[PDB]
């Protein structure tokens, strides 16, 4: 109901091809052309040279299973630094005497 629009949204891309698998918690923004074989590429599309970034088709008419989902991943890591963020507290009534 938000991202998908009539005509398609090409702003959101993804990396289809990479020479190996990424390490945990790694981000690679490199746009360098992926080389499948031994044929030289040098940033020019051609035989065994493919542009890795591909587009997500976004329209409201697509099926429910393939609808894009906005995913928010919270990374919980406990380091040796002093703890700060904590859960919410609760305040009760005050009585005297």
């Amino acid at each position: 109901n938000l991202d998908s629009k009539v005509g398609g949204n090409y702003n959101y891309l993804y990396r289809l091809f990479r020479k190996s698998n990424l390490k945990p918690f790694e981000r690679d923004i490199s746009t360098e052309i992926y080389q499948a074989g031994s044929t030289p590429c040098n940033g020019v599309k051609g035989f065994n040279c493919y542009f890795p970034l591909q587009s997500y088709g976004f329209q409201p008419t697509y099926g429910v299973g393939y609808q894009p989902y906005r995913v928010v991943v919270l990374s919980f890591e406990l380091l040796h630094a002093p703890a700060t963020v904590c859960g919410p507290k609760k305040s009760t009534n005050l009585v005297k005497n």
């Binding site: 289809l16 499948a36 065994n48 493919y50 591909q54 088709g57 429910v64 393939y66």
Partner: protein
């Protein structure tokens, strides 16, 4: 470094790009079919040419990956369709003229008409105009005027266009290393790469010929039954040992005999099963017709329909302002977008049609997890066969009494069931000889065994032998019967109709044995039985990614087509036809002619 790694990389990226353009190409055709506008006619040609030229550009990189170095079966099948260059193998002059002949023959068929001999001012087009009149017309001259005069301005006019259609399509198969163009359509059944399951292309010729031999004793008893009913009308023109006229088959080309079911009713003193009058009292609309059919797929274990399917369905035609084609068709766009364009009225046929149209959508959901290149039926006959077996279980009296259409006190006996098996036989039994006749004729002409002058000489000669039909007026080589046909002129597969009958009856017998149904096969109902849907779901998700001979064994246990389910399902009708034909002559002769005495 290996070719398999380079071929798989090309296929991984191609599946994404080909799926994006095919969706927009199918969406442009959807907006054009549902709404006639000047913007949609341009978007269909624009999006259609972008997807058509996309396969041509990717075919250049597809031929650079030989299949000899690939040991994977799924990779070679994805590169099998991409290896063919299509019309690019033809010369520049023959490639441009090929689309011209196809568009010319399709335009003449749509714009063709036969003016009334009695009313020269009124001129009615074939579809719907002439196709509707030929159904209910009982007159001898009225049917002959529309049947004979059509091929005069069409069959004779399309002859030079058909001669060019044969020459252009033969040069494409020769560049593709095919024996002829008749072998091109037989390449859809081709299976290679697996030991013992290999299926040769030339084997189909012997398969359709051998299975048709066991069809003859069933077809001869039905052909003599229809001839005995129409013998009293014209005893002079219709001989007991002769053949039936071509124009009296119930329509133009004699594809289906259902139009003759009115006069062929064995017992007119008993009511017939009809859900039309039952839905009127229940007050049902087009919204609940698809809803009740969706629960039929849930009772067998198959998944339900997505919310976008029922919301985007087109339930009617809003007058002439926005016009949509009422011909039922299941359109599959992609990425889970499923839509059906049909004009839904309240009739007994629309109930069985809803199960057929939703059968194609339910069939696409199983293999939808496969890549775009692997999304397809295993052959051309499995597409429509899956939707028919869903309608066969719905037409049974058991399923009608379940939801309340048919009264539970309705008497079901031999007299009621024989009347029902005869209606299906006219559509089924009458189709097999006619489909085997015209398809075998095309294979002989495309091969070169029949000279151009003998086209019509062998057409009617082999017609009395197969379907037992003789022409009232003899025709010369100028006329061409297949040129006016919808499937031949539009370059669609005509073989899918013959094999569909054999595939749908095999699946009907196998699913009823898995659910432990007893009695005759036409009494079987697959509703409420979840055991049969599980065995079928395994094959439905395979598609063409696996050999159709291997996927067929996982259901019926057979590696090829078999006539046994064809005879068993028609066995109750075959026993009744044999007793009624004792007073007549079983079979026909090819030496009888209406103009030769």
């Amino acid at each position: 470094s290996t070719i398999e790694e380079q071929a798989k990389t090309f296929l991984d990226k191609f599946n994404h790009e080909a799926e994006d353009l095919f969706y927009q190409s199918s969406l442009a055709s959807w907006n054009y079919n549902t709404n006639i506008t000047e913007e949609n006619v341009q978007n269909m040609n624009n999006a259609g040419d972008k997807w058509s030229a996309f396969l041509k550009e990717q075919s250049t990189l597809a031929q650079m990956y030989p299949l000899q170095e690939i040991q994977n079966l799924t990779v070679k099948l994805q590169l099998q369709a991409l290896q063919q260059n299509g019309s690019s193998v033809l010369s520049e002059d023959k490639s441009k003229r090929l689309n011209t002949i196809l568009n010319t023959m399709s335009t003449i068929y749509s714009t063709g008409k036969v003016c009334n001999p009695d009313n020269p001012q009124e001129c009615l087009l074939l579809e719907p105009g002439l196709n509707e009149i030929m159904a209910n017309s009982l007159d001898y001259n009225e049917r002959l005027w529309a049947w004979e005069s059509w091929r005069s301005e069409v069959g004779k006019q399309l002859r030079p266009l058909y001669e060019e259609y044969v020459v252009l399509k033969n040069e494409m198969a020769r560049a593709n290393h095919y024996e002829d163009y008749g072998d091109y359509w037989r390449g859809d059944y081709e299976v290679n790469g697996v030991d013992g399951y290999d299926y040769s292309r030339g084997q189909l010729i012997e398969d359709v010929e051998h299975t048709f031999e066991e069809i003859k004793p069933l077809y001869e008893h039905l052909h003599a039954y229809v001839r005995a009913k129409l013998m009293n009308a014209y005893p002079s023109y219709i001989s007991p040992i002769g053949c039936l006229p071509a124009h009296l088959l119930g329509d133009m080309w004699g594809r289906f005999w259902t139009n003759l079911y009115s006069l062929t009713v064995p017992f007119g003193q008993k009511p017939n099963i009809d859900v039309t009058d039952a839905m009127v009292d229940q007050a049902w609309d087009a919204q609940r017709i698809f809803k009740e059919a969706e629960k039929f797929f849930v009772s067998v274990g198959l998944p339900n329909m997505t919310q976008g399917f029922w919301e985007n369905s087109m339930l009617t035609d809003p007058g002439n302002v926005q016009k949509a084609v009422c011909h039922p068709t299941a359109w599959d766009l992609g990425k889970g977008d499923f839509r059906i364009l049909m004009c839904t009225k309240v009739t007994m046929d629309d109930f069985l049609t809803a199960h057929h149209e939703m059968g194609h959508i339910q069939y696409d959901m199983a293999y939808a997890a496969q890549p775009f290149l692997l999304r397809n039926g295993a052959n051309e006959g499995f597409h429509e066969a899956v939707g028919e077996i869903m309608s066969l279980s719905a037409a049974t009296p058991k399923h009608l009494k379940s939801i309340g259409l048919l009264s539970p006190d309705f008497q079901e006996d031999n007299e009621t069931e024989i009347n029902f098996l005869l209606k299906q036989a006219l559509t089924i039994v009458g189709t097999l000889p006619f489909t085997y006749m015209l398809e075998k004729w095309r294979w002989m002409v495309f091969k070169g065994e029949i000279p151009k002058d003998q086209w019509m000489k062998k057409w009617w000669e082999m017609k009395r032998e197969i379907v037992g039909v003789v022409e009232p007026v003899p025709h010369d080589e100028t006329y061409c019967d297949p040129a006016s046909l919808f499937h031949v002129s539009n370059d669609y597969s005509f073989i899918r109709y013959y094999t569909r009958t054999l595939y749908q009856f095999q699946f009907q017998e196998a699913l009823c044995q898995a659910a432990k149904h007893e009695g005759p096969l036409h009494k079987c109902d697959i509703s409420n039985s979840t055991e049969a849907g599980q065995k079928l779901f395994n094959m439905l998700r395979l598609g063409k990614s696996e050999p159709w001979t291997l996927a067929l064994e996982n259901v019926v246990g057979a590696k090829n087509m078999n006539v046994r389910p064809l005879l068993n399902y028609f066995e109750p009708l075959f026993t009744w036809l044999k007793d009624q034909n004792k007073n007549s002559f079983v079979g026909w002769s090819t030496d009888w002619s209406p103009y030769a005495d």
